[PDB]
Amino acid sequence: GKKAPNGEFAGRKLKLKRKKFRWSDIRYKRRVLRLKEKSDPLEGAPQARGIVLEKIAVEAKQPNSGMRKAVRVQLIKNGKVVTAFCPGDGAIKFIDEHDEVIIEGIGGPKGGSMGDIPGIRYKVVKVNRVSLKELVKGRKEKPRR
Amino acid sequence: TLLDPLANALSHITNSERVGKREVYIKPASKLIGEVLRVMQKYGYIGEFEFIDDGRAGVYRVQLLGRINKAGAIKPRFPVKVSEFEKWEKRFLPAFEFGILIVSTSQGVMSHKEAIEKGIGGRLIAYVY
Amino acid sequence: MRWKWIKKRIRRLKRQRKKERGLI
Amino acid sequence: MARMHARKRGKSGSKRPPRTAPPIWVEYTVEEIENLVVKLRKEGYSTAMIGTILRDQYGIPSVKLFKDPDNPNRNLTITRILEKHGLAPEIPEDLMFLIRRAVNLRKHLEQHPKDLHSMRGLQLIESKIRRLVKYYKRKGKLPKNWRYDPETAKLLVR
RNA sequence: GUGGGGUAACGGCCCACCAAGCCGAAGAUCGGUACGGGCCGUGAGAGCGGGAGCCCGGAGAUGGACACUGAGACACGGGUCCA
RNA sequence: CGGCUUUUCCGGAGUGUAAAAAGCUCCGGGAAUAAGGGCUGGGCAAGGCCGGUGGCAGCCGCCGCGGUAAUACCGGCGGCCCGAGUGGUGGCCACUAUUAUUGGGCCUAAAGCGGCCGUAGCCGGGCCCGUAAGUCCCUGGCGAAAUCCCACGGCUCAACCGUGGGGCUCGCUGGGGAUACUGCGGGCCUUGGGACCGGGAGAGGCCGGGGGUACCCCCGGGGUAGGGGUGAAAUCCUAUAAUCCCGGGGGGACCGCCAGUGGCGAAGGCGCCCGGCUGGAACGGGUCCGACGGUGAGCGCGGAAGGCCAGGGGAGCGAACCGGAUUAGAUACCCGGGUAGUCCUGGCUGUAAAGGAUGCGGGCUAGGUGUCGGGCGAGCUUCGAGCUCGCCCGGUGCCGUAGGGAAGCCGUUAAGCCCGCCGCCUGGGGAGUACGGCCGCAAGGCUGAAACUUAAAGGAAUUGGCGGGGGAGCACUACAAGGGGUGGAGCGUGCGGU
RNA sequence: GGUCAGGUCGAGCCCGGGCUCCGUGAGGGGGGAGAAGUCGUAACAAGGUAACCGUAGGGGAACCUACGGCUCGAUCACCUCCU
RNA sequence: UAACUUCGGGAGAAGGGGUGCCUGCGGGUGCGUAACCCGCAGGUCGCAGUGACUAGGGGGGCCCGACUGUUUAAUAAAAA
């Protein structure tokens, strides 16, 4: 034999073998339990709004130095602290403290950030329910409160 | 102890062929091997074979033509419907042409193509090609 | 290497199990 | 041919004759062969040795071949001959000899116990007896209300 | 198990008496997670994952408990009652 | 620029509504009249220039890009994709034979349980016969519609819908038939297995007995001033005298050469000799049972050294320890002392690079050589298989064909080709940790995670460089040998600094 | 339809305990990042005391040392192989 | 019926329920309806059924000493 039983009656042994051996996958083990849903806040949700506590900058990784623009936000329902990285150049200027902000993951929910950012898990799409990519371009819409 | 005596015999008979050996001597010997050998011979894969029935053991001495590409047996010996035959026919056989995926049937023992011609089937014993 | 580690683990286990034992 | 069980050394290359009917250059009547078997059994020789004597002395290699046909339900070979006369031990010569030897080791361990090897041998012998006994129960040389243990062994020997 | 009630009706459903069983490593029990099915998504297949409109069945109607009236209800837009 | 037609859009007619709208559809009027979004470095390339910026600001899915001529950033310009979409974040499947049934590994990459047994379980030699449970065939009862596929038909088209045929999670049912295969039942045989007799080798085990070498000590004699120890040394020992040397006696531990590329054992492991008890093991002869078989979750058992426990012992050795040296310092190499332990008995513990990093059994697949033990046919003989040639059986080594392997290697003692069965692995670190449970006297063992973080971790082989790594070989910017000199002074000169 | 006895179905409420899950505390350990300091030179070349290993004690630390194992082991020598 | 544990214990943990009289039964031991004892059902009164008398309050952390015992016969019984 190379390994696994083979007998007509033997099938339960194989059926159990695979399920046990399947758990050796981290991602399979995680989703099936719901270690993905629970651990990285959101409640599995695609997005969440929160109120801006403050605007902080974080330093870049091992090669890199730069003050990346970030907001510490508090997610509303969840009631957790998230650090969320602001896209676009000018962007941090639009976000007035205590506006309503909408937060997404970035680049796998797995926990991994972009390479450059250290602790930041998250992306900021919106300021006062209008996205930053809008605010980057002058013409479109321009913000409030 | 051995089991699957056919598998061992086939495994020898193929390894035999692989070498190009003149003849083969298979020591543990049976209906399973001998009926399969007679179906194999009937298609023309092997030449003449003699078994002396020793008070210890049949020995078969099989002539090798050189026609066999591979002959081995089927690990679980699964049951296979005549509709499932076509699945097995692509998996195991090298082409549609060769048609000895030996199956044991209600009719006696047949090849794969012979099993087809009657139409009938059963548990998978082995292959020859 | 492997010795390093065993004694670190044993010092960790024994000091921590001392903190369990003397938390016991 | 071989099998490695409590060793890595192959088993003896010895073989039976490939004979299938007998020499007529060796000559005995059915009446005469039963007499040879019975006499040797009376001495206290065992059935293995009994044939050994009959092959060396009387030139008969295996009983089966010589006798039958004379009643061709099955072969007439030493303990069958003996079973009809009522001379057979009820326990089979395989199972008897294994057990006996097993009692003899035990006595050595008693006065002597610091034995790694002899001790281990006791494990080995007993395990074979479990297999040999388990099949015999089914066929009917041993009743199923039996079970193997070492006092029960001393009770058979004695 | 025996006998008995109760119900539309079998039945430890309920009950009296009697027995000591019954279930479990061919994974019981317990914990977690979940309407189930037709289907669906992907995938050469095998396989994996999924229960969404719709259709099919059950469950439920602020949370819990309860009868009456009717063939039928313990009753989403009927009643009683506690929270 | 010339001509043509002319989507929205206007107006009308019916419709429909069984009130509109939906304004369709028919007709009249009538315009070239809604197009965007991403990327353009390698990966994908499917697509390159200029300006600005200058390891910033940014870009970012990864590898990466920006540190003053950036195709990667920003803007422009140009180009590629796609097109009423395009793109982001998240989830799922694919790719991933990275869950292996199709279709995966485990010598060294992750991975073999330190070994065994035998229970559940899986798997099982031949020959005959019964049944036909699995299995195959046929019939039939049946698994709604819908979705899916095919045909035709309908709506301007197609989506969708109608009709007709097929398939469906397809898990159930009944009767009839076949009997290779499998299951069961019965009978039958020796190839596997187990068993016997007789020769035989060995550092297997236990027990009794018994010798000597050396080390140590103690005692007398002899005999003076050092011995010991090292790279040098010191400590150290020794003057009521060491070391030495001679004789005498006591103690504990062991058994060089022998000794092998050797033997034995399941494994841990095993060496004076002798006898007794006792385990395994080869061969010839199959003489006896007659598939009794293989593997084996669970379970049970043995398991170095070190540690623990009780009791007894202690020469030499020696963690810890105490000095000395060395060193910058030395918690070390080196020396001089020393306790636990090393020994025994009883119990416990249960680990390991417990290795051949290679689980076990069977069958098949070039050989060569050496070697151990057994059989055989001879020659030799000291008449004993003592010396030797070969075939063969079992065992241990090397080399190598076919093949396998990434290579190194493996190659009838498989890592080849098959079959059966077990254990285990599935990127790295976190971490062999935490908790929980079990075990243990204790020390600790068994089991065994997640948060978080990473584009590697890793293996073999190549090339060079390197080494207080080895061998060969030269040199005068080398060292020695050797002669003269700089560093001391005054001055000249270049420099550092001021 | 009244009130009242006995009996039955029978929540929430309260108390005590059991199981399970979340937030969170003086104090105390390691863990993955960090550019740059400190101490020593541990491994990697025989890393200048071969290395690893199981276990036991000690030292600030890398570590050192004992015993027993292993070579994936060290230098020519050695021995032995092989030639 | 917890923590803990020298597995012996902790433990009578803790907490919750019941308990009277009458009327009628059953079981055990015996011998034949004695002498007692252990249960079961119904009916029913009080504020309360161990109604009296008899009769432990419990739980947790810490210090010390192992325990039991002994001690200043007669101001100290403890940790000594």
PDB file of all heavy atoms in Angstrom, chain F residues 214-223:
ATOM      1  P     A F 214      51.333  -5.445  37.308  1.00  0.00           P
ATOM      2  OP1   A F 214      52.741  -5.030  37.129  1.00  0.00           O
ATOM      3  OP2   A F 214      51.101  -6.135  38.548  1.00  0.00           O
ATOM      4  O5'   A F 214      50.410  -4.114  37.116  1.00  0.00           O
ATOM      5  C5'   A F 214      50.662  -3.302  35.942  1.00  0.00           C
ATOM      6  C4'   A F 214      49.584  -2.213  35.838  1.00  0.00           C
ATOM      7  O4'   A F 214      48.219  -2.781  35.684  1.00  0.00           O
ATOM      8  C3'   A F 214      49.369  -1.236  37.098  1.00  0.00           C
ATOM      9  O3'   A F 214      50.335  -0.178  37.128  1.00  0.00           O
ATOM     10  C2'   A F 214      47.862  -0.865  36.945  1.00  0.00           C
ATOM     11  O2'   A F 214      47.768   0.093  35.990  1.00  0.00           O
ATOM     12  C1'   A F 214      47.243  -2.049  36.519  1.00  0.00           C
ATOM     13  N9    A F 214      46.685  -2.918  37.544  1.00  0.00           N
ATOM     14  C8    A F 214      47.209  -4.079  38.052  1.00  0.00           C
ATOM     15  N7    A F 214      46.470  -4.633  38.979  1.00  0.00           N
ATOM     16  C5    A F 214      45.378  -3.778  39.084  1.00  0.00           C
ATOM     17  C6    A F 214      44.217  -3.813  39.883  1.00  0.00           C
ATOM     18  N6    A F 214      43.941  -4.789  40.757  1.00  0.00           N
ATOM     19  N1    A F 214      43.333  -2.800  39.744  1.00  0.00           N
ATOM     20  C2    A F 214      43.600  -1.833  38.858  1.00  0.00           C
ATOM     21  N3    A F 214      44.646  -1.696  38.045  1.00  0.00           N
ATOM     22  C4    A F 214      45.507  -2.715  38.212  1.00  0.00           C
ATOM     23  P     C F 215      50.573   0.477  38.524  1.00  0.00           P
ATOM     24  OP1   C F 215      51.710   1.445  38.423  1.00  0.00           O
ATOM     25  OP2   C F 215      50.771  -0.621  39.544  1.00  0.00           O
ATOM     26  O5'   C F 215      49.283   1.294  38.870  1.00  0.00           O
ATOM     27  C5'   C F 215      48.961   2.540  38.079  1.00  0.00           C
ATOM     28  C4'   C F 215      47.678   3.061  38.716  1.00  0.00           C
ATOM     29  O4'   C F 215      46.674   2.063  38.569  1.00  0.00           O
ATOM     30  C3'   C F 215      47.741   3.344  40.199  1.00  0.00           C
ATOM     31  O3'   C F 215      48.354   4.618  40.406  1.00  0.00           O
ATOM     32  C2'   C F 215      46.238   3.342  40.506  1.00  0.00           C
ATOM     33  O2'   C F 215      45.538   4.536  40.080  1.00  0.00           O
ATOM     34  C1'   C F 215      45.692   2.107  39.802  1.00  0.00           C
ATOM     35  N1    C F 215      45.663   0.849  40.554  1.00  0.00           N
ATOM     36  C2    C F 215      44.624   0.655  41.408  1.00  0.00           C
ATOM     37  O2    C F 215      43.724   1.523  41.439  1.00  0.00           O
ATOM     38  N3    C F 215      44.593  -0.457  42.188  1.00  0.00           N
ATOM     39  C4    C F 215      45.577  -1.366  42.093  1.00  0.00           C
ATOM     40  N4    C F 215      45.484  -2.463  42.877  1.00  0.00           N
ATOM     41  C5    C F 215      46.670  -1.194  41.202  1.00  0.00           C
ATOM     42  C6    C F 215      46.667  -0.084  40.439  1.00  0.00           C
ATOM     43  P     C F 216      49.257   4.779  41.663  1.00  0.00           P
ATOM     44  OP1   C F 216      49.887   6.151  41.764  1.00  0.00           O
ATOM     45  OP2   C F 216      50.115   3.559  41.656  1.00  0.00           O
ATOM     46  O5'   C F 216      48.273   4.653  42.873  1.00  0.00           O
ATOM     47  C5'   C F 216      47.228   5.613  43.007  1.00  0.00           C
ATOM     48  C4'   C F 216      46.242   5.198  44.120  1.00  0.00           C
ATOM     49  O4'   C F 216      45.461   3.980  43.758  1.00  0.00           O
ATOM     50  C3'   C F 216      46.837   4.853  45.419  1.00  0.00           C
ATOM     51  O3'   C F 216      47.178   6.091  46.122  1.00  0.00           O
ATOM     52  C2'   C F 216      45.739   4.103  46.111  1.00  0.00           C
ATOM     53  O2'   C F 216      44.736   4.883  46.673  1.00  0.00           O
ATOM     54  C1'   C F 216      45.180   3.248  45.115  1.00  0.00           C
ATOM     55  N1    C F 216      45.789   1.915  45.096  1.00  0.00           N
ATOM     56  C2    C F 216      45.213   0.954  45.865  1.00  0.00           C
ATOM     57  O2    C F 216      44.160   1.246  46.474  1.00  0.00           O
ATOM     58  N3    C F 216      45.786  -0.275  45.946  1.00  0.00           N
ATOM     59  C4    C F 216      46.904  -0.538  45.250  1.00  0.00           C
ATOM     60  N4    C F 216      47.418  -1.783  45.352  1.00  0.00           N
ATOM     61  C5    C F 216      47.522   0.445  44.431  1.00  0.00           C
ATOM     62  C6    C F 216      46.925   1.650  44.367  1.00  0.00           C
ATOM     63  P     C F 217      48.453   6.217  47.061  1.00  0.00           P
ATOM     64  OP1   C F 217      48.760   7.600  47.319  1.00  0.00           O
ATOM     65  OP2   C F 217      49.592   5.443  46.530  1.00  0.00           O
ATOM     66  O5'   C F 217      47.896   5.468  48.379  1.00  0.00           O
ATOM     67  C5'   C F 217      46.716   5.896  49.049  1.00  0.00           C
ATOM     68  C4'   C F 217      46.128   4.832  50.004  1.00  0.00           C
ATOM     69  O4'   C F 217      45.833   3.688  49.236  1.00  0.00           O
ATOM     70  C3'   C F 217      47.055   4.274  51.077  1.00  0.00           C
ATOM     71  O3'   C F 217      46.987   5.170  52.213  1.00  0.00           O
ATOM     72  C2'   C F 217      46.444   2.925  51.368  1.00  0.00           C
ATOM     73  O2'   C F 217      45.210   3.078  52.053  1.00  0.00           O
ATOM     74  C1'   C F 217      46.324   2.364  50.114  1.00  0.00           C
ATOM     75  N1    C F 217      47.239   1.535  49.326  1.00  0.00           N
ATOM     76  C2    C F 217      47.306   0.213  49.633  1.00  0.00           C
ATOM     77  O2    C F 217      46.527  -0.222  50.510  1.00  0.00           O
ATOM     78  N3    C F 217      48.198  -0.583  48.988  1.00  0.00           N
ATOM     79  C4    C F 217      48.991  -0.064  48.036  1.00  0.00           C
ATOM     80  N4    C F 217      49.844  -0.905  47.415  1.00  0.00           N
ATOM     81  C5    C F 217      48.937   1.313  47.689  1.00  0.00           C
ATOM     82  C6    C F 217      48.037   2.074  48.342  1.00  0.00           C
ATOM     83  P     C F 218      48.405   5.436  52.950  1.00  0.00           P
ATOM     84  OP1   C F 218      48.219   6.685  53.734  1.00  0.00           O
ATOM     85  OP2   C F 218      49.505   5.577  51.932  1.00  0.00           O
ATOM     86  O5'   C F 218      48.660   4.198  53.942  1.00  0.00           O
ATOM     87  C5'   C F 218      47.726   3.835  54.948  1.00  0.00           C
ATOM     88  C4'   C F 218      48.088   2.392  55.475  1.00  0.00           C
ATOM     89  O4'   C F 218      47.775   1.474  54.333  1.00  0.00           O
ATOM     90  C3'   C F 218      49.562   2.174  55.896  1.00  0.00           C
ATOM     91  O3'   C F 218      49.809   2.633  57.233  1.00  0.00           O
ATOM     92  C2'   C F 218      49.618   0.691  55.719  1.00  0.00           C
ATOM     93  O2'   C F 218      49.040   0.025  56.789  1.00  0.00           O
ATOM     94  C1'   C F 218      48.935   0.430  54.484  1.00  0.00           C
ATOM     95  N1    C F 218      49.667   0.336  53.219  1.00  0.00           N
ATOM     96  C2    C F 218      50.408  -0.784  53.007  1.00  0.00           C
ATOM     97  O2    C F 218      50.354  -1.691  53.867  1.00  0.00           O
ATOM     98  N3    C F 218      51.169  -0.885  51.886  1.00  0.00           N
ATOM     99  C4    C F 218      51.167   0.111  50.985  1.00  0.00           C
ATOM    100  N4    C F 218      51.927  -0.052  49.880  1.00  0.00           N
ATOM    101  C5    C F 218      50.396   1.289  51.176  1.00  0.00           C
ATOM    102  C6    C F 218      49.647   1.355  52.293  1.00  0.00           C
ATOM    103  P     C F 219      51.301   3.036  57.606  1.00  0.00           P
ATOM    104  OP1   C F 219      51.339   3.678  58.928  1.00  0.00           O
ATOM    105  OP2   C F 219      51.843   3.905  56.540  1.00  0.00           O
ATOM    106  O5'   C F 219      52.049   1.664  57.706  1.00  0.00           O
ATOM    107  C5'   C F 219      51.696   0.700  58.748  1.00  0.00           C
ATOM    108  C4'   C F 219      52.666  -0.472  58.590  1.00  0.00           C
ATOM    109  O4'   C F 219      52.209  -1.200  57.471  1.00  0.00           O
ATOM    110  C3'   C F 219      54.173  -0.245  58.280  1.00  0.00           C
ATOM    111  O3'   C F 219      54.788   0.127  59.448  1.00  0.00           O
ATOM    112  C2'   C F 219      54.450  -1.613  57.709  1.00  0.00           C
ATOM    113  O2'   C F 219      54.432  -2.629  58.703  1.00  0.00           O
ATOM    114  C1'   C F 219      53.392  -1.896  56.730  1.00  0.00           C
ATOM    115  N1    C F 219      53.627  -1.414  55.367  1.00  0.00           N
ATOM    116  C2    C F 219      54.298  -2.236  54.520  1.00  0.00           C
ATOM    117  O2    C F 219      54.601  -3.378  54.932  1.00  0.00           O
ATOM    118  N3    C F 219      54.614  -1.804  53.271  1.00  0.00           N
ATOM    119  C4    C F 219      54.240  -0.576  52.875  1.00  0.00           C
ATOM    120  N4    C F 219      54.562  -0.206  51.617  1.00  0.00           N
ATOM    121  C5    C F 219      53.531   0.302  53.738  1.00  0.00           C
ATOM    122  C6    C F 219      53.227  -0.159  54.966  1.00  0.00           C
ATOM    123  P     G F 220      56.109   1.027  59.341  1.00  0.00           P
ATOM    124  OP1   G F 220      56.344   1.472  60.717  1.00  0.00           O
ATOM    125  OP2   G F 220      55.907   1.971  58.201  1.00  0.00           O
ATOM    126  O5'   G F 220      57.275   0.032  58.863  1.00  0.00           O
ATOM    127  C5'   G F 220      57.516  -1.052  59.749  1.00  0.00           C
ATOM    128  C4'   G F 220      58.608  -1.963  59.117  1.00  0.00           C
ATOM    129  O4'   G F 220      58.023  -2.792  58.109  1.00  0.00           O
ATOM    130  C3'   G F 220      59.828  -1.390  58.428  1.00  0.00           C
ATOM    131  O3'   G F 220      60.890  -1.019  59.416  1.00  0.00           O
ATOM    132  C2'   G F 220      60.168  -2.592  57.526  1.00  0.00           C
ATOM    133  O2'   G F 220      60.685  -3.657  58.277  1.00  0.00           O
ATOM    134  C1'   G F 220      58.946  -2.907  57.012  1.00  0.00           C
ATOM    135  N9    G F 220      58.568  -2.199  55.797  1.00  0.00           N
ATOM    136  C8    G F 220      57.674  -1.166  55.710  1.00  0.00           C
ATOM    137  N7    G F 220      57.570  -0.680  54.506  1.00  0.00           N
ATOM    138  C5    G F 220      58.431  -1.460  53.746  1.00  0.00           C
ATOM    139  C6    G F 220      58.762  -1.391  52.375  1.00  0.00           C
ATOM    140  O6    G F 220      58.324  -0.613  51.508  1.00  0.00           O
ATOM    141  N1    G F 220      59.718  -2.342  52.029  1.00  0.00           N
ATOM    142  C2    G F 220      60.284  -3.228  52.886  1.00  0.00           C
ATOM    143  N2    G F 220      61.200  -4.026  52.370  1.00  0.00           N
ATOM    144  N3    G F 220      59.976  -3.318  54.162  1.00  0.00           N
ATOM    145  C4    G F 220      59.051  -2.405  54.522  1.00  0.00           C
ATOM    146  P     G F 221      61.862   0.163  58.960  1.00  0.00           P
ATOM    147  OP1   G F 221      62.643   0.595  60.139  1.00  0.00           O
ATOM    148  OP2   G F 221      61.083   1.208  58.256  1.00  0.00           O
ATOM    149  O5'   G F 221      62.856  -0.503  57.931  1.00  0.00           O
ATOM    150  C5'   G F 221      63.542  -1.722  58.237  1.00  0.00           C
ATOM    151  C4'   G F 221      64.121  -2.280  56.943  1.00  0.00           C
ATOM    152  O4'   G F 221      63.067  -2.716  56.058  1.00  0.00           O
ATOM    153  C3'   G F 221      64.995  -1.399  56.049  1.00  0.00           C
ATOM    154  O3'   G F 221      66.323  -1.270  56.544  1.00  0.00           O
ATOM    155  C2'   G F 221      64.895  -2.100  54.724  1.00  0.00           C
ATOM    156  O2'   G F 221      65.670  -3.275  54.685  1.00  0.00           O
ATOM    157  C1'   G F 221      63.504  -2.368  54.721  1.00  0.00           C
ATOM    158  N9    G F 221      62.645  -1.360  54.114  1.00  0.00           N
ATOM    159  C8    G F 221      61.745  -0.565  54.771  1.00  0.00           C
ATOM    160  N7    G F 221      61.152   0.290  53.988  1.00  0.00           N
ATOM    161  C5    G F 221      61.675   0.024  52.731  1.00  0.00           C
ATOM    162  C6    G F 221      61.433   0.646  51.486  1.00  0.00           C
ATOM    163  O6    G F 221      60.653   1.579  51.222  1.00  0.00           O
ATOM    164  N1    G F 221      62.214   0.093  50.475  1.00  0.00           N
ATOM    165  C2    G F 221      63.113  -0.910  50.643  1.00  0.00           C
ATOM    166  N2    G F 221      63.784  -1.270  49.563  1.00  0.00           N
ATOM    167  N3    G F 221      63.339  -1.512  51.789  1.00  0.00           N
ATOM    168  C4    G F 221      62.593  -0.994  52.786  1.00  0.00           C
ATOM    169  P     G F 222      67.013   0.149  56.652  1.00  0.00           P
ATOM    170  OP1   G F 222      68.188   0.033  57.543  1.00  0.00           O
ATOM    171  OP2   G F 222      66.002   1.173  56.994  1.00  0.00           O
ATOM    172  O5'   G F 222      67.525   0.397  55.168  1.00  0.00           O
ATOM    173  C5'   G F 222      68.331  -0.596  54.519  1.00  0.00           C
ATOM    174  C4'   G F 222      68.295  -0.410  52.997  1.00  0.00           C
ATOM    175  O4'   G F 222      66.947  -0.603  52.488  1.00  0.00           O
ATOM    176  C3'   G F 222      68.656   0.951  52.421  1.00  0.00           C
ATOM    177  O3'   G F 222      70.084   1.072  52.388  1.00  0.00           O
ATOM    178  C2'   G F 222      68.003   0.920  51.056  1.00  0.00           C
ATOM    179  O2'   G F 222      68.740   0.137  50.157  1.00  0.00           O
ATOM    180  C1'   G F 222      66.749   0.347  51.300  1.00  0.00           C
ATOM    181  N9    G F 222      65.623   1.230  51.574  1.00  0.00           N
ATOM    182  C8    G F 222      65.015   1.409  52.788  1.00  0.00           C
ATOM    183  N7    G F 222      64.068   2.303  52.759  1.00  0.00           N
ATOM    184  C5    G F 222      64.032   2.721  51.436  1.00  0.00           C
ATOM    185  C6    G F 222      63.228   3.695  50.803  1.00  0.00           C
ATOM    186  O6    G F 222      62.327   4.397  51.295  1.00  0.00           O
ATOM    187  N1    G F 222      63.557   3.835  49.457  1.00  0.00           N
ATOM    188  C2    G F 222      64.531   3.144  48.815  1.00  0.00           C
ATOM    189  N2    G F 222      64.713   3.450  47.543  1.00  0.00           N
ATOM    190  N3    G F 222      65.277   2.222  49.383  1.00  0.00           N
ATOM    191  C4    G F 222      64.979   2.067  50.688  1.00  0.00           C
ATOM    192  P     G F 223      70.766   2.415  52.854  1.00  0.00           P
ATOM    193  OP1   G F 223      72.224   2.347  52.610  1.00  0.00           O
ATOM    194  OP2   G F 223      70.315   2.747  54.225  1.00  0.00           O
ATOM    195  O5'   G F 223      70.091   3.413  51.832  1.00  0.00           O
ATOM    196  C5'   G F 223      70.535   3.362  50.465  1.00  0.00           C
ATOM    197  C4'   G F 223      69.791   4.397  49.623  1.00  0.00           C
ATOM    198  O4'   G F 223      68.371   4.105  49.582  1.00  0.00           O
ATOM    199  C3'   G F 223      69.865   5.802  50.199  1.00  0.00           C
ATOM    200  O3'   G F 223      71.102   6.383  49.779  1.00  0.00           O
ATOM    201  C2'   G F 223      68.619   6.445  49.600  1.00  0.00           C
ATOM    202  O2'   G F 223      68.818   6.822  48.256  1.00  0.00           O
ATOM    203  C1'   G F 223      67.593   5.340  49.652  1.00  0.00           C
ATOM    204  N9    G F 223      66.788   5.375  50.866  1.00  0.00           N
ATOM    205  C8    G F 223      67.084   4.751  52.048  1.00  0.00           C
ATOM    206  N7    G F 223      66.218   5.000  52.988  1.00  0.00           N
ATOM    207  C5    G F 223      65.277   5.819  52.379  1.00  0.00           C
ATOM    208  C6    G F 223      64.117   6.432  52.903  1.00  0.00           C
ATOM    209  O6    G F 223      63.648   6.352  54.052  1.00  0.00           O
ATOM    210  N1    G F 223      63.478   7.221  51.950  1.00  0.00           N
ATOM    211  C2    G F 223      63.904   7.403  50.675  1.00  0.00           C
ATOM    212  N2    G F 223      63.176   8.221  49.935  1.00  0.00           N
ATOM    213  N3    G F 223      64.970   6.827  50.164  1.00  0.00           N
ATOM    214  C4    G F 223      65.608   6.057  51.069  1.00  0.00           C
TER     215        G F 223
END
